[PDB]
Design a binder for this molecule. Structure first.
Ligand SMILES: Nc1ncnc2c1ncn2[C@@H]1O[C@H](COP(=O)(O)OP(=O)(O)O)[C@@H](O)[C@H]1O
Ligand SMILES: Nc1ncnc2c1ncn2[C@@H]1O[C@H](COP(=O)(O)OP(=O)(O)O)[C@@H](O)[C@H]1O
Ligand SMILES: Nc1ncnc2c1ncn2[C@@H]1O[C@H](COP(=O)(O)OP(=O)(O)O)[C@@H](O)[C@H]1O
Ligand SMILES: [Mg+2]
Ligand SMILES: [Mg+2]
Ligand SMILES: [Mg+2]
Ligand SMILES: [Mg+2]
Ligand SMILES: [Mg+2]
Lengths: 532, 526, 528, 98, 93, 155
């Protein structure tokens, strides 16, 4: 009849297939949630190993075929990009929402009503979180940042080492702090250059009060350390001058060839002399430096580094006050290098790190920067440390930007479930079932934590729900809103007092993204797969 | 036809089976090199896929030649490489320790204890191990050359070079001492770049020595060059001494008759000008990283100057360090400072059927060449590996002068101290703590096993001995299987090596304990 | 894992353990349930299954559909086996048992996923099932008068309720009355083999008839058969197990003669043996001769010459039915054909039914057997009519055993669910969730009825729950009026044994599936 | 204990928690495991119950024997100690009758 | 090829069984040494039967020079790794 | 819309329910009814041309090449080499009509085809098929009663 070249799935078949794919994706990463979660080994059939706990990384490395599973993977990636934390919780919540919504649909509830109920439940959950479950960080102080970093780094390779890594992360984030127009203190994470190097233990990871370059001097002749550095950042190569494409040298008088060839390098000689005549000590350029220019720097006792990365050069110039010069051309058509185009640093040292060397630009003036050197046991451990450290930095940035945090350990999810279950009776007649199922699906996070802890998930979640119900029914028991889970002892615990925090933005964005993904997948009721 | 969530070739397994497999793979890696520890260790023969042969008893050298499929074994091999690169010694010890801790962790994982608790106990035990090691250490006077030689000897008693111990110790100590540099308030040793080991098969091993300078495998460019100069003045260059094209396209247009001859004469005159610029400094030896033209050779030789060409950049840097010269790219910028005075002799002599250039009488040189002469290539490779281990140990001691008793004494003392500490925790994580504390006894155990003595009786006697007050230095004699105090046997290790071994082993155990799922088969997607 | 140079089990052995395999087992049970999901209720639909050889089977019976499916999943085969058990013990409820068991498993799946110990689930299932069975026995309606009219009406209503889901639901009253009439003439054992079912192609469904006696197809008549009269007004039937034709006297017999006179004497002796048997049969006074063994042409002509009727090679069960109805005795020896070993019937007749000839033995006052002659348009039509009649017959037999009835249409399930929820609201709470899940799973039957009828399941379930909460034990789904109604007063009656067995079997299957933790599949042997 | 679905080479499905039946329907190939299975079957034939006890005790004994061999004992010493301890256990057992 | 891949990160040396592709009898009898070179999606080097021009136990340098005979070879050591949104840095503004 | 339910798991482990489930097709719901109605319509439209005094013969060839020119509907459908199950049902319908009556074995096929053609457009409007069957049965009872009413006896 149709005569279309492909397969067709219609009705409950395609819906069940989509829910199966989402559930499989959720079960892939369900075992890596919460402090009692465990990492995963990923092998790419070539011999490369990626030990990771990040949900976004796991879903990115895996090659997936089903479109709904791809939707969940992109959801995790988007959560990672826009927040930096909660990449596993968003996927689990979205899959649970999809499963419960499909159960409702199989109960002959129209998907439009389910979608409307889900949207209303998401709005009410966000409003309730922003009205009741937020804790202002103004009165908490640096302890709030430390606790947020420790909570973020739990369930990672740097978990128990939180007492030290949280201080390190907070110091780095505060170091890279800057303010802009509209009076907003903006924290540009990814300005912290994360350098990995196996060797000593995690305790030997260093927080550089400056910047760290994964580069060395171009020649062994130059000194490896300069005290009062005058950093000169350049964006052009220092090589023998070559005529451009449109210029060709044609010789008719033999006497001029030697002069031509001499000036061919005298041009670069003069440029280097102009640069060095102002007292520059450290010269960083993105382009290459050949042997003759390297010797020019050697004789003057300078420090020349070639093939410096563009982002690294920009960060060094911004921190040290130097201006990146793509050319030595001024507004008078001349070749000049003013002294004001020089950066300043308190030291530039080429340190040795496990039979390898890197350049440390220490204590730059006019701006404070930061870099991190992660010391581990092998490359895989260093990569996992870097991923966890990036997660912690993102969490600290979120806490510092928006001054609201919420208790962790499933407390917010349980409170939301209780409130939405109570609220569903006040809206609609058929979408109330959708709101109730949204509330029930919100309970998948504490259940997953308890399951990962190998404790009595049913009884523990029942106790948590009872605590939150008592909090929401009795006006005088508002202090019970912070009751979460203590996974080590398997008992409910006041997480706000215990120091388990996370940014409100993480929960809000995860809820919104999961609701949108569930709505998107729920609309599909007929799939046509054309034959390639 | 089929529809799947993941790819067809994506295979996933999880649960207790993954942990058991990881721990079994680690134990297998440890068992591979278990018998290669101690003064009585036996060598191994490795066949390279390229046809070469590696005959050694070093942990890293053995492990880097093994190709494995289990990612846990890959992690263990990376651990071996990390230990070798960071400190240069203790490569077998860290692997054995990691295997033992993973076994004693598997014991607890069989029960209902979560891996995170075991990891926390391991971290606490690692901190206590660091504390105990720092406590039981002793200082070393680096000025005393005899003590340094004894330390190097204790480092190389377990290798194939131990039969020539005084010679190897003196070679390593002299190389490390004279490669030491301190410029601009920065102290560096730099064994990797300078202090190159050059091996020539043949001769006898006792003829090996460390030179007060640099030896390279090069010969003079012309026969009439002098092959023996008493007190040469050496100039080093990068740029070629030959006429070369420019960067820009520079085609000529000849219309007059004499223009071709004039171009050729200008080329010759440019070569002569470069050679005159070189000669104006009045040197005796010219070394170039690139080619030297025949006309340039003639013009240099007219001034009685020996020229060597096509030398590697690393060799040129080593020569500059040794003879106190400075590499100059453009000859017209040569100064009196750039000329390297300090070499006390230069000689190009014939070894076997090949010429070698010697600069071997430098005064206060900052670079050296170790001349190894042995039975064959494989023997010389093993000797070079042992010398590298000795020099790494010497550098570690020079950087940190702390010293630690060897032969299992330090490990037994640390285990006893950790057990005494565990006698007071009274918690639920005390059992993994005590287990990983007692897991340190594997290396005294394997020392006894390799010695061939009875493991149980000797281990019980040593454990009883360490329960006394002042018995931290009581270890096992590696070649007689007897309990001997190590302030008499003299076997001691640098503190840095022990610290790195413990940290790396415990962190490997933590990393492999934190994993309970393995997914494989997916494409790189790049 | 490690290669382990020598391994424990044979290569190819597959082992799946833990929560994932239990979840997969529940999913497989769901997949089996949805195969027969749409065959339940008066709005149910038939399913067509084609075998490897191309033969097609069209059925509404759940057990038949499950059997025709080549199910190989170890956990899923349990549902097929319990459907077979339900068909064997009762004969009705084959679709309900699978749905109930799958709904139990689906309702307890969320608790399984979160690490609940399966023993708690098993204990909760056992307790809930015991309470539900006791409640069914308590609230089941029985009449303590044994009035023949009342029992007749009860059996007819039960048969109508059983039949009102098949392709013969339009004529459910006709077939129900016929089935009750057929069953009541069985004496004490209610043997199925005493109710013959004949399928004759061609004819309307209403053309099917119940014979107060025995009827069977004509069986390969010989020459001279058409001479025999085909109607008798008071025949005596000679039921025989005898081969009436010329043949060797014995397999190992051998005749040795040396004179032509002895040759002729032997030939005459064989002929005289045959004629002596025939003459004894004739002198017995019988007019209809039935033999399990073949009757030869000579005997056929002999009986035709005497205005007698003969029919050899009769199927053995048909001769048993004839003996039970007419009231004779099967004789292997014709030497003593007394008057008490000859059957009697008012009318014997051979008539054409849809292009086939059937012998009729009607008018038997002491008949204890029956014969259904089903008329249909094809083989599968008649086979499905026979299956529906078998369901009705088993229901009527069970109702004869005990006249305990409950209202259908999900009314009993709603009452049980309400009772179980009320009970579960008075226990500490670990069992409360599981018993509540059991009670909710009991709601599948009315929901499936509404879904099959194209209804709005949620509204009908809400109305039924509200009704049962405030009173009314027998309120169920009313398919015709798109509403709920008192099913007991609508004569939607089922024996309580059907629901009792359904609940017991579903609970046992669910407990057996839940109790498993690991599945091991050994490598196949002799695949060829 | 939990029932196990065991499918042999003939598509015959066994669900049970009886150790002897599980071992019987399992295609055990390792000779040492075959020996322990033979011991369990002999226990089933002699008494009829206790097969799982036999299997568990043998496994624990062999694991601890592996540990003893690893710490530095000999096979003969472990065997002699096991025999002495088994004799002591058989002596103690009658006193434990309640 | 192992040594070449170790030294050369750009090139994509790969191996495949002759029978898996499904070569003919002549290829399987006298064309086992085959060097298939791809560039731009099309062949630029199609060496087969290289034993005579290479040997039997040749070294890495020998095959490298053989490949270099037709100009087939395109023209520091980090610690372990360096590569860690687009917000880079600002200052006061 | 075939191969049963092609999932193969929820977790990743093998999920095999029915033997050879990867080589078995399945049609559900309204699509199966549409296919059956279309098949019966094709059979009836083929058969309707041989109806009446002006009907044209059909010329069958069996698997051995033998030729059978005939107008008998039951004979035409019996020798037809069909594979669709609904076509086999229609052939058996004709055989039943031939067995019971012996005449009108073609009118039954056309009547069934027309009934299913009308049922197709009735199903397109959302009527449950059982309602269509019940209405057809009621109308058939009415038609049979009318036929009995307008019947005439002969000597
Ligand atoms: N110390 C703790 N106690 C209880 N719960 C915690 C603790 N630390 C983190 N959690 C909870 O564990 C959950 C899982 O976080 P995780 O999976 O590590 O983050 P992500 O989802 O970004 O990977 C978080 O929602 C958090 O609330
Ligand atoms: N004479 C000796 N007696 C006892 N133990 C020794 C002696 N010499 C060395 N050892 C021990 O042997 C170990 C060195 O073994 P080695 O083969 O170097 O393995 P690794 O490379 O892992 O250190 C040291 O830990 C030291 O304590
Ligand atoms: N007239 C009716 N009205 C409502 N429901 C009915 C009616 N007749 C039967 N049922 C329901 O149909 C179900 C049984 O359907 P059926 O397919 O006939 O037998 P099975 O129990 O094998 O599925 C019973 O649960 C009964 O409640
Ligand atoms: Mg996190
Ligand atoms: Mg050593
Ligand atoms: Mg029924
Ligand atoms: Mg027992
Ligand atoms: Mg006609």
């Amino acid at each position: 009849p149709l005569s279309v070249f492909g397969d067709r799935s219609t009705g409950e078949t395609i819906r069940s297939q989509n829910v199966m794919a989402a559930a499989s994706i959720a079960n892939i990463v369900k075992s890596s949630l919460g402090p009692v979660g465990l990492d995963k080994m990923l092998v790419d059939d070539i011999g490369d190993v990626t030990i990771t706990n990040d949900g976004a990384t796991i879903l990115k490395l895996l090659e997936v075929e089903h479109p709904a599973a791809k939707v969940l993977c992109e959801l995790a990636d988007l959560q990672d990009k826009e927040v930096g934390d909660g990449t596993t919780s968003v996927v689990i919540i979205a899959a649970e929402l999809l499963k419960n919504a499909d159960e409702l649909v199989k109960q002959k509830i129209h998907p439009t009503s389910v979608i409307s109920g889900y949207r209303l439940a998401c709005k009410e959950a966000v409003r309730y979180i922003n009205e009741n479950l937020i804790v202002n960080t103004d009165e908490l102080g640096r302890d709030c940042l430390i606790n947020a970093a420790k909570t973020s780094m739990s369930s990672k390779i740097i978990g128990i080492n939180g007492d030290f890594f949280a201080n390190m992360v907070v110091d780095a984030v505060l170091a890279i702090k800057y303010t802009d127009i509209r009076g907003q203190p903006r924290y540009p994470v990814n300005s912290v250059n994360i350098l990995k190097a196996h060797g000593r233990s995690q305790m030997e990871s260093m927080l550089i009060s400056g910047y760290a370059l994964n580069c060395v001097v171009g020649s062994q002749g130059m000194p490896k350390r300069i005290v009062n550095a005058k950093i000169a950042c350049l964006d052009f190569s220092l090589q023998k001058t070559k005529m451009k494409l449109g210029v060709q040298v044609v010789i008719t008088d033999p006497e001029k060839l030697d002069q031509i060839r001499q000036r061919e390098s005298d041009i670069t000689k003069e440029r280097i002399q102009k640069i060095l005549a102002t007292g520059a000590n450290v010269i960083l350029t993105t382009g290459g430096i050949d042997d003759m220019c390297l010797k020019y720097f050697v004789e003057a006792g300078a420090m020349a580094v070639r093939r410096v990365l563009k982002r690294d050069l920009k960060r060094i110039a911004k921190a040290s006050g130097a201006t990146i010069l793509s050319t030595l051309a001024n507004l008078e058509g001349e070749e000049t290098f003013e002294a004001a185009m020089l950066g300043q640093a308190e030291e530039v040292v080429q340190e040795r790190i496990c039979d390898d060397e890197l350049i440390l630009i220490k204590n730059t003036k006019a701006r404070t920067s930061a870099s991190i050197i992660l010391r581990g046991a092998n490359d895989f451990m260093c990569d996992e440390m870097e991923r966890s450290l990036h997660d912690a930095l993102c969490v600290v940035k979120r806490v510092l930007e928006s001054k609201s945090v919420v208790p962790g350990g499933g407390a917010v999810e349980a409170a939301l479930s209780i409130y939405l279950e109570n609220y569903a009776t006040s809206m609609g007649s058929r979408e109330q079932l959708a709101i109730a199922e949204f509330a029930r699906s919100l309970l998948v996070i504490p259940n997953t934590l308890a399951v990962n802890a190998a404790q009595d998930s049913t009884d523990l979640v029942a106790k948590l729900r009872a605590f939150h119900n008592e909090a929401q029914v009795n006006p005088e028991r508002k202090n019970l809103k912070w009751i979460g889970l203590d996974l080590s002892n398997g008992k409910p615990r006041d997480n706000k007092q215990a120091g388990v925090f996370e940014p409100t933005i993480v929960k809000v964005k995860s809820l919104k993204f999961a609701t949108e993904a569930a709505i998107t997948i729920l609309r599909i009721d007929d799939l046509i797969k054309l034959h390639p | 036809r089929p529809v799947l969530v993941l790819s067809q070739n994506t295979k996933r397994e999880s649960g207790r089976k993954v942990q058991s497999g990881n721990i079994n793979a680690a134990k297998t890696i440890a068992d591979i090199i278990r018998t290669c520890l101690g003064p009585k260790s036996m060598m191994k023969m490795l066949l390279d896929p390229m046809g070469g042969i590696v005959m050694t008893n070093d942990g890293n050298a053995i492990l880097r030649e093994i190709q494995v499929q289990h990612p846990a074994a890959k992690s263990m091999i990376e651990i071996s490489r990390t230990q070798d690169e960071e400190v240069g010694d203790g490569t077998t010890s860290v692997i054995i320790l990691a295997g033992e801790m993973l076994s004693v962790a598997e014991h607890f994982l069989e029960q209902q204890m979560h891996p995170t608790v075991v990891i926390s106990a391991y971290r606490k035990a690692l901190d206590d191990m660091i504390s105990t090691l720092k406590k039981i250490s002793i200082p070393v006077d680096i000025s005393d050359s005899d003590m340094m030689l004894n330390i190097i000897n204790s480092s190389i008693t377990t290798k194939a070079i131990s039969r020539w111990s005084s010679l190897a110790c003196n070679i390593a100590l002299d190389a490390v001492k004279m490669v030491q540099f301190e410029e601009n308030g920065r102290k560096e040793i730099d064994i990797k770049k300078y202090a190159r080991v050059e091996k020539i098969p043949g001769g006898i091993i006792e003829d090996s020595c460390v030179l007060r300078g640099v030896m390279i495998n090069k010969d003079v460019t012309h026969p009439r060059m002098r092959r023996y100069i008493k007190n040469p003045r050496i100039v080093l260059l990068d740029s070629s001494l030959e006429y070369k094209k420019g960067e820009s396209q520079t085609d000529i247009e000849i219309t007059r008759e004499e223009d071709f001859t004039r171009i050729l004469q200008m080329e010759e005159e440019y070569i002569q000008q470069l050679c005159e610029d070189i000669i104006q400094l009045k040197p005796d030896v010219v070394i170039t990283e690139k080619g030297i033209s025949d006309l340039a050779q003639h013009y240099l030789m007219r001034a009685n100057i020996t020229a060597i060409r096509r030398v590697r950049k690393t060799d040129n840097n080593r020569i500059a360090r040794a003879c106190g010269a400075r590499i100059v790219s453009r000859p017209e910028e040569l100064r009196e400072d750039d000329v390297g005075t300090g070499a006390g002799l230069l000689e190009i002599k014939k070894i076997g059927d090949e010429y070698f250039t010697f600069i071997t009488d430098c005064k206060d040189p900052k670079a050296c060449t170790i001349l190894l002469r042995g039975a064959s290539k494989e023997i010389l490779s093993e000797v070079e590996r042992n010398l590298q281990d000795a020099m790494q140990v010497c550098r570690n001691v020079l950087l940190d002068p702390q010293l630690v008793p060897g032969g299992g004494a330090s490990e037994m003392a640390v285990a006893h101290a950790l057990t005494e500490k565990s006698k007071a925790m009274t918690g639920v994580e005390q059992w993994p703590y005590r287990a990983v504390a007692q897991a340190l006894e594997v290396i005294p155990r394997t020392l006894i096993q390799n010695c061939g003595a009875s493991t149980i009786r000797l281990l019980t006697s040593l454990r009883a001995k360490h329960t006394q007050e002042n018995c931290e230095t009581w270890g096992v004699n590696g070649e007689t299987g007897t309990l001997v105090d190590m302030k008499e046997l003299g076997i001691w290790e640098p503190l840095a090596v022990k610290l790195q071994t413990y940290k790396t082993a415990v962190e490997t155990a933590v990393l492999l304990l934190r994993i309970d799922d393995i997914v494989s088969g997916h494409k790189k997607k790049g | 894992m490690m290669p382990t140079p020598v391994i424990l089990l044979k290569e190819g052995t597959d082992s799946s353990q833990g929560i994932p395999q239990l979840v997969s087992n529940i999913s497989a049970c769901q997949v089996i349930a949805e195969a027969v999901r749409t065959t339940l209720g008066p709005r149910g639909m038939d399913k067509l299954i084609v075998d490897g050889r191309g033969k097609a089977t069209i059925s509404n019976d759940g057990a038949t559909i499950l059997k025709l499916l080549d199910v190989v999943h170890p956990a899923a085969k349990t549902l097929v086996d319990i459907a077979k058990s339900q068909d064997a013990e009762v004969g009705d409820g084959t679709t309900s048992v699978t749905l109930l068991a799958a709904e139990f498993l689906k309702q307890v799946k969320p608790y399984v996923e979160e690490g609940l110990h399966p023993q708690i689930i098993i204990r909760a299932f056992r307790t809930a099932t015991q309470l539900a069975v006791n409640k069914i026995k308590e609230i089941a309606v029985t009449v303590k008068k044994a009035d023949k009219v009342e029992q007749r009406k009860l059996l007819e209503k039960c048969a109508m309720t059983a039949l009102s889901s098949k392709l013969i639901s339009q004529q459910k009253a006709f077939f129900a009355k016929m089935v009750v009439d057929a069953v009541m003439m069985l004496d004490d054992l209610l043997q199925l083999k005493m109710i013959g079912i004949k399928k004759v192609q061609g004819g309307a469904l209403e053309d099917s008839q119940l014979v107060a006696g025995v009827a069977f197809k004509k069986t390969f008549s010989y020459a001279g058969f058409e001479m025999q009269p085909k109607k008798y007004h008071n025949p005596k039937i000679a039921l025989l197990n005898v081969e009436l034709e010329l043949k060797a006297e014995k397999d190992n017999a051998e005749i040795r003669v040396h004179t032509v006179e002895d040759y002729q004497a032997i030939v005459d002796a064989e002929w005289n043996i045959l004629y002596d048997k025939l003459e004894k049969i004739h002198h017995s006074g019988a007019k209809v001769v039935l033999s399990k063994l073949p009757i030869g042409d000579v005997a056929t002509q002999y009986f035709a010459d005497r205005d007698m009727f003969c029919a050899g090679r009769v199927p053995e069960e048909d001769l048993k039915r004839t003996m039970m109805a007419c009231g004779g005795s099967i004789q292997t020896s014709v030497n003593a054909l007394s008057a008490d070993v000859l059957g009697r019937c008012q009318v014997f007749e051979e008539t054409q039914i849809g292009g086939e000839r059937y012998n009729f033995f009607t008018g038997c006052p002491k008949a204890k057997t029956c014969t259904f002659i089903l008329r249909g348009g094809a083989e599968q039509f008649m086979e499905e009519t026979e299956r529906s009649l078998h369901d009705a017959i088993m229901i009527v037999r069970r109702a004869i055993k005990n006249d305990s009835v409950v209202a259908g249409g999900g009314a009993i399930e709603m009452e049980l669910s309400k009772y179980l929820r009320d009970y579960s609201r008075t226990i500490p709470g670990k069992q409360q969730l599981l018993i509540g899940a059991y009670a909710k799973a009991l709601e599948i039957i009315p929901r499936q009825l509404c879904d099959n009828a194209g209804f709005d399941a949620t509204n009908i379930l809400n109305k039924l729950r509200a009704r049962h909460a405030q009173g009314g034990t027998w309120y169920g789904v009313d398919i015709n009026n798109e509403d709920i109604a008192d099913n007991f007063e609508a004569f939607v009656w089922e024996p309580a044994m059907v629901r009792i067995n359904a609940l017991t079997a579903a609970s046992e299957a669910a407990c057996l599936i839940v109790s498993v933790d690991e599945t091991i599949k050994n490598p196949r042997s002799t695949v060829d | 204990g939990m029932n196990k679905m065991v499918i042999n080479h003939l598509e015959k499905l066994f669900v049970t928690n009886d150790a002897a039946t599980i071992l019987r329907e399992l295609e055990v190939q390792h000779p040492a495991a075959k020996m322990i299975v033979m011991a369990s079957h002999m226990q089933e034939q002699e008494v009829g119950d206790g097969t799982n006890f036999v299997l568990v005790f043998a496994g624990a004994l062999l694991e601890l024997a592996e540990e003893l061999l690893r710490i530095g004992l000999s096979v003969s010493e472990v065997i002699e100690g096991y025999e002495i301890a088994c004799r002591k256990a058989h002596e103690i057992l009658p006193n434990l009758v309640c | 090829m192992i040594c070449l891949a170790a030294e050369y990160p750009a090139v994509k040396f790969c191996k495949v069984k002759s029978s898996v592709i499904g070569a003919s009898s002549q290829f399987t009898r006298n064309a086992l040494p085959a060097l298939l070179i791809y560039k731009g999606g099309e062949l630029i080097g199609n060496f087969v039967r290289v034993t005579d021009q290479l040997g039997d136990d040749f070294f890495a340098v020998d095959l490298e020079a053989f490949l270099q005979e037709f100009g087939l070879l395109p023209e520091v050591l980090t610690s372990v790794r360096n590569s860690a949104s687009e917000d880079s840095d600002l200052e006061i503004d | 819309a075939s191969m049963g339910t092609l999932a193969f798991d929820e977790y990743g482990r093998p999920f095999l329910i029915i033997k050879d489930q990867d080589r078995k097709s399945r049609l559900m719901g309204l699509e199966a009814l549409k296919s059956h109605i279309m098949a019966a319509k094709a059979v009836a439209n083929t058969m309707r041309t041989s109806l009446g005094p002006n009907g044209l013969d059909k010329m069958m060839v069996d698997k051995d090449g033998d030729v059978t020119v005939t107008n008998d509907g039951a004979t035409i459908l019996s020798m037809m080499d069909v594979d669709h199950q609904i076509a086999k049902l229609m052939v058996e319908l004709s055989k039943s009509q031939d067995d019971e009556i012996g005449d009108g074995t073609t009118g039954v096929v056309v009547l069934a085809g027309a009934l299913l053609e009308e049922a197709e457009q009735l199903l397109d409007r959302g009527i449950h098929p059982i309602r269509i069957a019940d209405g057809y049965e009621q109308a058939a009872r009415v038609a049979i009663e009318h036929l009995d009413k307008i019947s005439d006896s002969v000597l």
